[PDB]
Ligand binder design. Structure first.
Ligand SMILES: Nc1ncnc2c1ncn2[C@@H]1O[C@H](COP(=O)(O)OP(=O)(O)O)[C@@H](O)[C@H]1O
Ligand SMILES: Nc1ncnc2c1ncn2[C@@H]1O[C@H](COP(=O)(O)OP(=O)(O)O)[C@@H](O)[C@H]1O
Ligand code: SF4
Ligand code: SF4
Ligand SMILES: [Mg+2]
Length: 593
C-alpha cells in the first residue's frame, strides 16, 4: 500500500529573498528547472510560495535555504480527511482533535508549535476551525464531525448551551489587561462562592492586597488558576498551569484541579511536567509532528500506557515513531554497585541576608555522581549554589576548593553581541565537530538550528538551551545547573536529561542540578539534597541522602505518593485516595526504588 501528500511550510519570519540571491528557491528547484511551478514568487508581498500540488518533496530547496525558512514533509493521504485547521498558505496545519469527557481529566502532551493551544481555542469556541479550507461556520464543522462523539459537543457549542472556562497559557499578559488588586478580581469572577477555599489551597492569602503588575510569574499563574476555579461552569480547560510554579506548588494544584472531575465536571489540561500530567490525567493524548509545521492528535490513551509509549517515541496504535531514540529509566536492579571517592567536601555553611537565613548541613560530594536539589522557592537553593560556585561569600563556614566549575545560572539575561556558533566555537571548536557531542548535546537540544541567530535575539527557551549547551561543552571538575527545565517543552526537558546524564557519565564528572520537574530529577540523580523551612524567611538544606530517603522526606511535605512502572521504570504517581496511595502513606512510603 501507499498514499502520500506533500506539505510545505515556510517560516517567512526567517526568509529574506535579497540575502540568498534572488529567491534561491525557484533557482535551485528541480521542478522549476524543467519548466514547472513548484515554487512561485509573490512579487508583491515579496515572499516565495510552494505549490504543494507540484513539489516532488525532493527537499533540495530545504537544504539550500541559507537559513532554514523551509520545511517539506511527506505525509500519508488519510489525514487529509481529518484535517482540522490550517493558518494559511504554507502555514502550520493541525490534524484531529482531543476528546473531552464528563467527570474526568483528559491530559494533552507534546512539543510546542504542534497545536496544543490551537485545539483549546477551537473546543472552547474562541476559534472556529477552517477545516483546512475557507470554512467560517460551525455547521460545516458539525457536518465534518458527523459520527464522531464531538459532533454533539459542537452542536451544543454553537447553540450556546455550553461555554468552556479557560486558564490561558500566557499569564504574563494578565497584568496589562486588568487593574486593581487580587482581592477585587477574584470577587467578580467568583460564581460558586469559594473565595476562601480557593485562595487558601493556592496559598494566596498574602498576595490578595497587592496589585496585578506587582505580582511575579508564580503568583500571576496562581491568580489565573484561581479565577478559573471560581467560575461556575462545567468545562474547564487549563493550558500549561505548571509554568512558574515550584516543585511543591505544581504538585498541589494538580490535586486541586483533578477534584473538579469529582464534582462531575469535564477537565482538560495541557502539560509539560510528565509527573504532573500523570497525577492529573485519566485519559491522555500525544501530539506528534514537526514544530511550527503540523501537528496530529493521537487516539485517546490510558494515562499509564499513553505516557510510556510517549517515553519510547513510538505510538503503537497510530504506529508512528516521533523520536529516533527512546528514553528509558534504569530499573534499579540494573544499577551498578559503586563505592565512589570523595571529590570535595563542604562544612556547615550559613548565609544570612539579615531578612533571610539559610543554613547548610555538612556534606560530601563524590566523584562521578549527580546530586539533585529540590525544595520550594525562596528557600535558598540558588544561594546555596552560588556559594559552591564561589560567586557568593558565606556568612559563616567556608568553601575553599581547588576545582574548576562550570556554572549554568538560573536567571540568565543574555548580554553578548554575537551568534550562538561564535559563542560555542570559542569554548571548544573540536567538540562542536565531535560525532559524540553533536549526537548527545548539539542536535538533541537544537543548537544547530540556532548557530546563525544572535545571542541577544534568542527567546527564553532557546537561551536556556544554549546556556545549558555552553555549560556542558566546558571541561570542569564539577558542573552546576540551576533550574534547566524553565521555558522548555516536554521534549526539550527529556533531551536535556539524557544529555546531562550522558555527558557526565561519559567524561566521568560530577554535577549538581536544582530542579522542580520530578522526572528530570529522578532521571539524572544519583543522590538528593532536600530543603525545608519558611520560604522567604529561613531555609535548611539537609545532607546528601539516598534517592528513596530523599524523595520520602520531600514528598511527605506535599502528600503525594509514587510507585514504579514495572515496564518503563519511571516514577508512577498515585491519585489522591487510591488503594495504593493509602497503603503507601500508611507505611510512610511515598517513593519506591
Ligand atoms: N494565529 C496564528 N497564525 C499563524 N500561525 C499560528 C497562529 N497561532 C499559532 N500559529 C502557529 O501554529 C503552531 C502551533 O500553535 P500553538 O497551538 O500555539 O502550539 P502549541 O500549543 O503546541 O505550542 C505554531 O508553529 C504557531 O506559530
Ligand atoms: N541579596 C539579598 N538580600 C535579601 N534577600 C535576598 C537576597 N538574595 C536573595 N534573597 C531572598 O532569599 C530568599 C531565597 O533566595 P534563593 O536562594 O534565590 O531561593 P531559591 O530556593 O528560590 O533559589 C528569597 O526570599 C529571596 O528574596
Ligand atoms: S525561503 Fe530561503 S532561499 Fe527561499 S527566499 Fe526565503 S530565504 Fe531565500
Ligand atoms: S522540495 Fe523539491 S520539488 Fe518541492 S519545492 Fe523544493 S526543490 Fe522544488
Ligand atoms: Mg499563492
Amino acid at each position: 500500500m501507499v498514499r502520500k501528500m506533500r506539505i510545505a511550510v515556510i517560516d517567512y519570519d526567517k526568509c529574506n529573498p535579497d540575502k540568498c540571491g534572488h529567491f534561491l528557491c525557484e533557482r535551485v528547484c528541480p521542478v522549476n528547472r524543467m519548466g514547472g511551478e513548484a515554487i512561485i514568487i509573490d512579487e508583491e508581498n515579496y515572499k516565495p510560495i510552494i505549490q504543494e500540488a507540484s513539489c516532488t518533496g525532493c527537499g533540495i530547496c530545504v537544504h539550500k535555504c541559507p537559513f532554514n525558512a523551509i520545511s517539506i514533509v511527506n505525509l500519508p493521504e488519510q489525514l487529509d480527511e481529518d484535517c482540522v485547521h490550517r493558518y494559511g498558505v504554507n502555514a502550520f496545519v493541525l490534524y484531529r482533535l482531543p476528546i473531552v469527557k464528563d467527570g474526568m481529566v483528559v491530559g494533552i502532551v507534546g512539543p510546542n508549535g504542534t497545536g496544543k493551544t490551537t485545539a483549546v481555542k477551537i473546543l472552547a469556541g474562541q476559534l472556529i476551525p477552517n477545516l483546512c479550507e475557507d470554512n467560517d461556520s460551525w455547521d460545516n464543522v458539525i457536518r465534518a464531525f458527523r459520527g464522531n462523539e464531538l459532533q454533539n459537543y459542537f452542536e451544543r457549542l454553537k447553540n450556546g448551551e455550553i461555554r468552556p472556562v479557560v486558564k490561558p497559557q500566557y499569564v504574563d499578559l494578565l497584568p496589562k489587561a486588568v487593574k486593581g488588586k487580587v482581592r477585587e478580581l477574584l470577587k467578580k469572577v467568583d460564581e460558586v462562592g469559594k473565595f476562601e477555599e480557593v485562595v487558601k489551597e493556592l496559598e494566596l492569602e498574602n498576595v490578595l492586597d497587592r496589585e496585578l503588575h506587582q505580582l511575579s510569574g508564580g503568583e500571576l499563574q496562581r491568580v489565573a488558576i484561581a479565577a478559573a476555579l471560581l467560575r461556575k461552569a462545567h468545562f474547564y480547560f487549563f493550558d500549561e498551569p505548571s509554568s512558574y510554579l515550584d516543585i511543591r506548588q505544581r504538585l498541589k494544584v494538580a490535586r486541586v484541579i483533578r477534584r473538579l472531575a469529582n464534582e462531575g465536571k469535564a477537565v482538560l489540561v495541557v502539560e509539560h511536567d510528565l509527573a504532573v500530567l500523570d497525577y492529573l490525567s485519566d485519559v491522555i493524548h500525544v501530539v506528534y509532528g514537526e514544530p511550527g509545521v503540523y501537528g496530529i492528535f493521537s487516539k485517546p490513551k490510558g494515562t499509564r500506557n499513553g505516557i510510556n509509549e510517549f517515553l519510547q517515541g513510538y505510538l503503537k496504535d497510530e504506529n508512528v515513531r516521533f523520536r529516533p531514540y527512546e528514553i528509558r529509566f534504569t530499573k534499579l536492579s540494573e544499577r551498578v554497585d559503586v563505592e565512589r571517592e570523595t571529590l570535595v567536601e563542604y562544612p556547615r555553611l550559613v548565609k544570612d541576608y539579615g531578612s533571610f537565613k539559610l543554613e547548610v548541613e555538612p556534606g560530601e560530594i563524590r566523584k562521578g555522581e549527580v546530586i539533585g536539589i529540590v525544595g520550594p522557592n525562596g528557600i535558598g537553593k540558588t544561594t546555596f549554589v552560588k556559594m559552591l560556585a564561589g560567586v557568593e561569600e558565606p556568612t559563616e563556614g567556608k568553601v575553599e576548593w581547588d576545582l574548576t566549575v562550570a556554572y549554568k545560572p538560573q536567571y540568565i539575561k543574555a548580554e553578548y553581541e554575537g551568534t550562538v556558533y561564535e559563542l560555542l566555537s570559542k569554548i571548544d571548536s573540536s567538540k562542536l565537530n565531535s560525532n559524540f557531542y553533536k549526537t548527545e548535546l548539539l542536535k538533541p537540544l537544537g543548537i544547530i538550528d540556532l548557530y546563525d541567530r544572535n545571542v541577544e535575539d534568542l527567546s527564553g527557551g532557546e537561551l536556556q538551551r544554549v546556556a545549558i549547551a555552553a555549560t556542558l561543552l566546558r571541561d570542569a571538575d564539577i558542573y552546576l545547573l540551576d533550574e534547566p527545565s524553565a521555558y522548555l517543552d516536554v521534549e526539550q526537558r527529556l533531551a536535556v536529561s539524557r544529555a546531562i546524564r550522558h555527558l557526565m557519565e561519559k567524561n566521568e564528572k560530577t554535577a549538581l542540578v536544582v530542579e522542580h520537574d520530578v522526572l528530570m530529577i529522578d532521571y539524572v540523580s544519583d543522590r538528593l539534597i532536600v530543603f525545608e523551612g519558611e520560604p522567604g524567611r529561613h531555609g535548611r538544606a539537609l545532607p546528601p541522602m539516598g534517592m528513596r530517603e530523599g524523595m520520602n522526606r520531600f514528598l511527605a511535605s506535599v502528600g503525594i505518593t509514587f510507585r514504579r512502572d514495572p515496564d518503563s521504570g519511571r516514577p508512577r504517581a498515585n491519585k489522591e485516595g487510591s488503594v495504593k496511595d493509602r497503603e503507601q502513606k500508611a507505611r510512610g512510603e511515598y517513593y519506591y526504588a
